[PDB]
């Protein structure tokens, strides 16, 4: 699982790998209200819910 701050992974004696998430979503912005709520929900799973 990848944290929003990024994840570091070390495999054996190899140099460590670093990963970061992007703000990807299956929702849309600038569209219909039911498409916009999904856009923000997926990107911000906690606050979107609290604010709404």
């Amino acid at each position: 699982t990848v944290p929003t701050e990024g994840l570091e992974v070390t495999w054996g004696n190899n140099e460590p790998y670093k990963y970061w998430p992007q703000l990807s979503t299956n929702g849309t912005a600038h569209g219909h209200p039911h498409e916009i709520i999904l856009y923000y929900y997926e990107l911000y799973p906690t606050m979107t819910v609290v604010v709404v």
Partner: protein, 439 residues
């Protein structure tokens, strides 16, 4: 000119700043941290090492009693056993088969290997900060190394940079550190003079060359089995050896905040906590007068494409009209949008192109080039590759910013509710007041 800015301690991320000196063309500097180091001051308490048990030949005295006296060795005992009748390869040890005694003794001392294989127990207190900084000054990129205490100032092309002092002092190293050959482990060393048998601390010495060794290894001598000369002993196994096998994981692999811990000297590299303030003094000579510099007029902005991705997402085309051919400076005036290109070249009437990376869904950014401000607006669509291997370059986003089509729907709904409340309130106000007039 005195200029002060603050840059986050995240390594490998460029941040940019604008120097405002009215009457002169604006200067833009780009600075990036290449490395940040925290170097703690350590004080050695003691060294833990492997011990060896020394057992000198036994003394065999037949037809008589042997005796031994106390010695001042680190861990020593002696015992005399009676009724011993040992044999040699060629027959019984001696003529006498009665009233025989044997003296056995043993002691513990540091092995010769303690000059190569050892763990040092240190106390930690405070740490000095330093950093490797790369600053783009007028189109040259110069690299400067400075302490971040706030006490070192470095000279780049006749300009003064005084890095520091760091905002927060979280240090990965804890209060007590045990350092083996290559890695630092946070642990609570047992205090000097109190090591329990069989764990870290069975044999402890104050300095590598010191001759005072305190060892509590439980050596108890035992009776020689009949028919032989062996001097049997029972001892807990070496403490250091057991720690080496069951070490756990060193701080380098388990520290918080992405630190890398390296040794000789013990140091922490690239920890991402806090903001390091940078203050720059720029000599008056470098600044260039407004009249000499190119001046830009008639600017309009159209954003062909926007994608909110960590890498530089969108291109913006800006149309400029310029007095003369010269270098010019570009800087965003809103925090969210960051513009990759510091300087672009302008001539005649043409289009300049700047690349922007942002995390804002609908973007409203004012970009200023050579003292004129042009406003650019666009709609951004989300990125479709889920995980990337490079650090995020856009700054973070806050609840203030919601997308434009989002705002409109919020305003309308909230407004509709508000009107209903207001109409209702007016009705109450009227009825209540009329009732007061009525008697």
């Amino acid at each position: 000119y005195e200029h002060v800015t603050v840059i986050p301690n995240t390594v490998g991320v460029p941040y940019k700043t604008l120097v405002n000196r009215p009457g002169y063309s604006p200067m833009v500097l780009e600075m990036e941290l290449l490395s940040v180091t925290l170097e703690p001051t350590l004080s050695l308490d003691y060294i833990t090492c492997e011990y060896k048990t020394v057992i000198p030949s036994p003394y065999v005295k037949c037809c008589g009693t042997a005796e031994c006296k106390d010695k001042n060795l680190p861990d020593y005992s002696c015992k005399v056993f009676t009724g011993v009748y040992p044999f040699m390869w060629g027959g019984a040890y001696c003529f006498c088969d009665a009233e025989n005694t044997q003296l056995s003794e043993a002691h513990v001392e540091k092995s010769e290997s303690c000059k190569t294989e050892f763990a040092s127990a240190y106390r930690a207190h405070t740490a000095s900060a330093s950093a490797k900084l790369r600053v783009l000054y007028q189109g040259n990129n110069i690299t400067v190394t400075a302490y971040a205490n706030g006490d070192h100032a470095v000279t780049v092309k006749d300009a003064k940079f005084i890095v520091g002092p760091m905002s927060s002092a979280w240090t990965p190293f804890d209060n007590k550190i045990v350092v083996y050959k290559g890695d630092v482990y946070n642990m609570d060393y047992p205090p000097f003079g109190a090591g329990r048998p069989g764990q870290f601390g069975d044999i402890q010495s104050r300095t590598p060359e010191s001759k005072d060794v305190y060892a509590n290894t439980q050596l108890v001598l035992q009776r020689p089995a009949a028919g032989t000369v062996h001097v049997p002993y029972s001892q807990a196994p070496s403490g250091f050896k057991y720690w080496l096998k069951e070490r756990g994981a060193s701080l380098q692999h388990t520290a918080p905040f992405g630190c890398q811990i390296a040794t000789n000297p013990v140091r922490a590299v690239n920890c991402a906590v806090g903001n390091m303030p940078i203050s720059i003094d720029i000599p008056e000579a470098a600044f260039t007068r407004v009249v000499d510099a190119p001046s830009l007029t008639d600017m309009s902005c159209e954003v062909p494409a926007c994608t909110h991705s960590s890498d530089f997402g969108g291109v913006a085309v800006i149309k400029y009209a310029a007095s003369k051919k010269g270098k010019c400076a570009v800087h965003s005036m809103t925090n969210a949008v960051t513009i990759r290109e510091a300087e672009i070249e302008v001539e005649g009437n043409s289009q300049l192109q700047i690349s922007f990376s942002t995390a804002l869904a609908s973007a409203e950014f004012r970009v200023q080039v050579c003292s004129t401000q042009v406003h650019c607006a666009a709609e951004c669509h989300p990125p479709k590759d889920h995980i990337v291997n490079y650090p995020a370059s856009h700054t973070t986003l806050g609840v203030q910013d919601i997308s434009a089509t989002a705002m409109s729907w919020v305003q309308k709904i909230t407004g509709g509710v508000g009107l209903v409340v207001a109409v209702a309130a007016l009705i109450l106000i009227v009825v209540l007041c009329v009732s007061f007039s009525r008697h």
